[PDB]
Amino acid sequence: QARNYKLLRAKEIRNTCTYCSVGCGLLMYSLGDGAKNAREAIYHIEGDPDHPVSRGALCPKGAGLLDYVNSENRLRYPEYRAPGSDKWQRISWEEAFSRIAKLMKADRDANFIEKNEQGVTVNRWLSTGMLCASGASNETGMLTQKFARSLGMLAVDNQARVXHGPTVASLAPTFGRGAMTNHWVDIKNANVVMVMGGNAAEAHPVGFRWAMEAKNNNDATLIVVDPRFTRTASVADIYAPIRSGTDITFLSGVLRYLIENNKINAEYVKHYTNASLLVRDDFAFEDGLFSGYDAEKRQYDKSSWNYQLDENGYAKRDETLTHPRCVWNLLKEHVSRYTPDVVENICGTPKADFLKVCEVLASTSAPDRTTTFLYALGWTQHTVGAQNIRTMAMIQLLLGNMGMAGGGVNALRGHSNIQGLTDLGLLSTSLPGYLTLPSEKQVDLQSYLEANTPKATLADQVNYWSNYPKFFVSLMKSFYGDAAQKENNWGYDWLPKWDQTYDVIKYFNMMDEGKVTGYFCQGFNPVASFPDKNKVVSCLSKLKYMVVIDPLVTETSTFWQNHGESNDVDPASIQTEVFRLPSTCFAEEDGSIANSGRWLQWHWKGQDAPGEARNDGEILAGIYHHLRELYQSEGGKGVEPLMKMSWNYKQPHEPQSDEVAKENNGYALEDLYDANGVLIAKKGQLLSSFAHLRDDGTTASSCWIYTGSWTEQGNQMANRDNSDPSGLGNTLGWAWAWPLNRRVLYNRASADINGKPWDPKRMLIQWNGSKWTGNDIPDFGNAAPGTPTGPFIMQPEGMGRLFAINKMAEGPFPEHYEPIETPLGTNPLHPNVVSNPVVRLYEQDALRMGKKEQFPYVGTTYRLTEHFHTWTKHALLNAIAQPEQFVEISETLAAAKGINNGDRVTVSSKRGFIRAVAVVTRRLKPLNVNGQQVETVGIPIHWGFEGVARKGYIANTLTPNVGDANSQTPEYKAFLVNIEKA
């Protein structure tokens, strides 16, 4: 008979996939029953059938996790690479901690900046920076935040900088928050699923099941708009090509089409958007530039990009929408230039295809039909990334799809916990809960709070950010405890104050000038992920010290090692001291991570890490305690802010996940009472809602939007009730979502002004005469139907913005601008303004930009379903699935170059080259653009010089070092290359 079932007596552990943001549930199996004498060893992993999002499924990455956990390249011991050396030397943990602490203290004492030139205390350290792990837990994230800021660091970023930064920069100004608005299962309720600016079937496969459910079982139309015919296109009803970097033209064309054909949800637009608000008379746009442009500083004076004010100081309105200055009429005028012919001429999209897309999207302007957009990097990684997203968000507002089940903007997050690290503020000028570090111009607490607490711009609005002081003081109480009091302004001056944003491109420009001494790379592989790899390696080579914390060997940890063409360096010429510290992976700790739908999910430990590997919190603690002890006995610069930071854990060298998660949730530090004299919480208890946070020092929380995640009722992130009473796919009992378990953001907009559902078959909330109740937690207060209170409660005007006032760097309305490296060498809409006029481009990088005469083809980089960045190539199962590096080109380009399918080729740019196998296919076709034939060369990003897949080249060897004008997110999706037979 068959072999016996191999898991019958194994230990079963629940955990979550460590790769993308879908957050699939896992059931891991270990050899051993937990007895102390048996050392657990995971030997099989499969899906959790009860998880509502994945329902047992796992894509090739999740399904192959065993080979990552047990990779031959797992790190085992602390290792050190000496200056000019070509080998690693194993050292003890104590040696690593002491050496690192000594290096850090010497650098901090030499370069710490206590006061700026204007005499303000700024307590900042800029000569050592850090990259944080979006693949690690929220608890690791908070410890990292405390570690970095208490030391005064401002060059602190996580993957968000090179990923969804543009989304936050655009969706927050448009809707009030930067997060994905709905959730995975909810996609099944859509009538139209739009995959543009993303490739969900390859980048979020298990989550994509719900788009297939919408298509197959809800009769939805699936549309894919991409320069390549992808695996998502394989199952699409409609496929339309588009040239990389032209989305704003295509989307603005859709806006023009909707307005011209009156295919909008008029009542939704009139009441829920700022369509009726009047704009200042001095606002204008002409020939590619908005009013207020300063050509020398290459920035805009945004004074004119604002509303006209009435006698009470609120925005003036014209409910009839006839006034020439209302947002609605100005929007109509702005997009009038984007005709179908213009779309075809710039995007290359045939008019017949564009028409099909317009018609289908237009069909969802009906109140009971919705479109949901699924996007990611195809839109974010451009110099106009934030504006790409602005245009789509505007479309969803015109169609009345925000706040609707089956609608919304599903900005699909990347790393398993990039959402959590963004929430916790591991970005240069951020603090947890979307709070902001003080700028150096804000000399006192009062000035700081006033700058961050917005005044309402229309009467009768929730304007919830008015509560900023309560969140800030509570954060300070969590950080400093008894040391933070009213008398010393809650420790205000201990936080580092910024003079500017220290984004990664800027910081590496500084590194190249010799201004950076050390760098930490915690679960981040910049040699593989940063743009212009040859320059990146050159920059890192100038560092005096580097500390890598990871569960795997990474290209960054071995940047000093010669790997032939893949990494042609001379170890003897690189003086950097490199420390490589072995950490745990997802399966070796308990903790929480936030998925794309804002679900904070708890997971449990399945085995101990291999060799001497330690968990991330232990590694930080080891370095931190060694460093603070040096300060205790030697003194030094910036002693007080460092020593005042709390590290209140039962075992200081081993902070536990539950301790940190509870800190994030928050506590009542004194008994708390409501206005009627009723006790809401007792001293020492966990808080149940951020509504209970106060600005008087009686409450603490290190992440206010997480209050409710772990209460006196227990760890809500561990909830496993998959009940869906409404049938809409909303499972309030599984895990816990922020804010306050609201699964669909902006849900008040799922109903009209009288509280009646736009679609009676999709009711999310309803009015019972005294409060809002329903199938989801209301993302609203208790304003009765008919009142002026808007549904976008984080907006000072309570509306979705069609006109983004003074929030965007390059304009209150999106506008087409070509990529820095463009195949046309001009912009057909306005030749006088070719690329984004507010883009920052350092002189050194401008010299490394190519032109179409030498690099005629559009280069773009993307993913394949089988691999996750340069991480999975360390796992055998995935290496077997896609073993060797390739690039994709059309049959037309291959024929012109004499390249046969499977032949070896050399793809190059102004910055470098890679060699690979050519995948010649009709899935890539040239487009007719502005009278030329434009070809695209596709470059997947999964291979490199470490791993078990066949050795290859870092794709970023080709990419330009320039980014979005708002977030400085690199333009990895549209540049120029050349190709030759190899």
Binding site: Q1, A57, C59, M212, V235, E866, V919
Partner: protein
Amino acid sequence: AMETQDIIKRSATNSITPPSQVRDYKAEVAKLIDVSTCIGCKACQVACSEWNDIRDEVGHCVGVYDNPADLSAKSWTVMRFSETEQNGKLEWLIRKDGCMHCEDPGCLKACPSAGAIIQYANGIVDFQSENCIGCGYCIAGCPFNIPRLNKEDNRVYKCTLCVDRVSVGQEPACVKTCPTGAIHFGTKKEMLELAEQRVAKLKARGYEHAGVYNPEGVGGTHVMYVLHHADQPELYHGLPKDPKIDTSVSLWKGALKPLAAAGFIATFAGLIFHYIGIGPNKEVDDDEE
């Protein structure tokens, strides 16, 4: 062997001495692969190898997404990709390939080693390796070119329909893992029902020739497909149209055997009765009188 007492077919076993099969009152099971919902992620390849404790070599890219390029002793299922414009517009047809678990398996029919291949009452066709001699007859007998020899032990291996999971009540590893639900599993009766419902939906979307692939030529299969273009199965990387056991194999394993048996028996009789009837042919039968 035969511990489960539900073996309905056994290789190289005379028809008058059938295998133990008293416990045959069990519903037939089946896997249904709806290629119209497949996204070619290869999760099934990974889940299969992980569950089955096998790993193929790290291969090469020769111009296509397909990898490994073929089924092997270490790869029991592989995704096969096809780009075509045969139907009026560009289509990317992706199909999961592996054992079809035929009701009338050609591998079992061609196999010369007793018990090397068996068929369970529930429809699973499996290899009992202790009896495999590595002749490879099953590779030619299979209408779908599925069996693969392992050079390291001279035995064939293929998809077992996760017999080790199904036997104790759990669905196969690839079935469970499929991100989009392109792969379904259950009793064959209800999988046929799901297949027809899916075909109806595809027809409603404009695929007038959508259909279920459950070939009558091999008695139906326990791994079936829902195809957008059932009138052109070759489009899906060579899936056979109207597959059946080859006529030469049927004759070789069929009538040739008893015919040869009769010749042998008849020849032995003839020669024996001949010797006895006429007697030896010695130098002189004449001076013996």
